[PDB]
């Protein structure tokens, strides 16, 4: 690939790390080979969990720097989107932004880091990403929005697995309201 | 659970959660970066997918993800990654630029235009990047003119 200039950097452990990272969507696909349903639930959850705070505080303190940077990115992204939608220069510098990513901005306004999390999950693709790629010949395309929904739904599960199920629940709310803000 | 959520919300990442070091992550970036330059795009894509999940605030993992997708002809999915990457680094011109290329390949001229146009502005502002700024300017013309002959 000679098309994109990636920034310059800086053996079995890396496969460990790759397995770690895909662990949440692997379990997600597994759990979604059933009949769950919902699907169209009755106030999402319980879910389920079926199948330590001092540490978290250590970690948080160990990474105060990165965490603040990430907060700033979300702040600067929110603002950029704020100042773009007031001005008439919305679709001049950001008309290239895809619809998905556009909702992800919404999700970040509603749920900050949880919004980003689920948003990145959707974009990464993970479970049904390979099907989705394959879907690239063939007819009209209402197949599109549903493959989103598929992805959204898988991402929510993956969040549920990887982090809280309250996190997944918030993530669902985020996606919900970013989706309404979109109209 | 509410502690994990608050962590996630405040901007913690999966890397942090699993005590993954900056240097292990960099190793994995290197692998992905070499694989991409080796033309092993499909394998590079898988690596960047892991990175993006491990730290979902690094624009360059999204740049890599997007570059793999574009090389595989997956233009639509590449725009999605280039879009999220831009939001994480609003001053980086490569994002609108390569998204525009992707948009042009799909016939979306209005958005191709927007991409090449922002890519130029952002690349102009940094004087290390005049070559890219120029490419953006050219493609901008190519697009405006392809737009007029529609």
From TrEMBL, chain A:
Portion held of the full protein: 45 to 263 of 347
Name the UniProt record assigns to this protein: AopB
Localization in the cell: Host membrane
Organism (species): Aeromonas hydrophila
Superkingdom, taxonomy of origin: Bacteria
GO cellular component: host cell membrane
This protein's UniProt keywords: Coiled coil, Host membrane, Membrane, Transmembrane, Transmembrane helix, Virulence
Membrane-spanning intervals of the chain: 93-111, 117-135, 146-168
Entry membrane topology: Multi-pass membrane protein
Coiled coil residues, start to end: 52-87
Stated family: Belongs to the SctE/SipB/YopB family.
Domain Translocator protein BipB-like C-terminal per the UniProt entry, residue ranges: 49-182
Keyword field contains Cytoplasm: no
UniProtKB/TrEMBL annotation, chain B:
Signal peptide range in chain numbering: none
Positions of Mg(2+) binding: 8, 12, 57
SUPFAM superfamilies: TPR-like (SSF48452)
GO MF entries: metal ion binding
The keyword Metal-binding appears for this protein: yes
Keyword field: Metal-binding
Source superkingdom: Bacteria
Protein name stated in the entry: AcrH
Organism: Aeromonas hydrophila
Lineage: Bacteria, Pseudomonadati, Pseudomonadota, Gammaproteobacteria, Aeromonadales
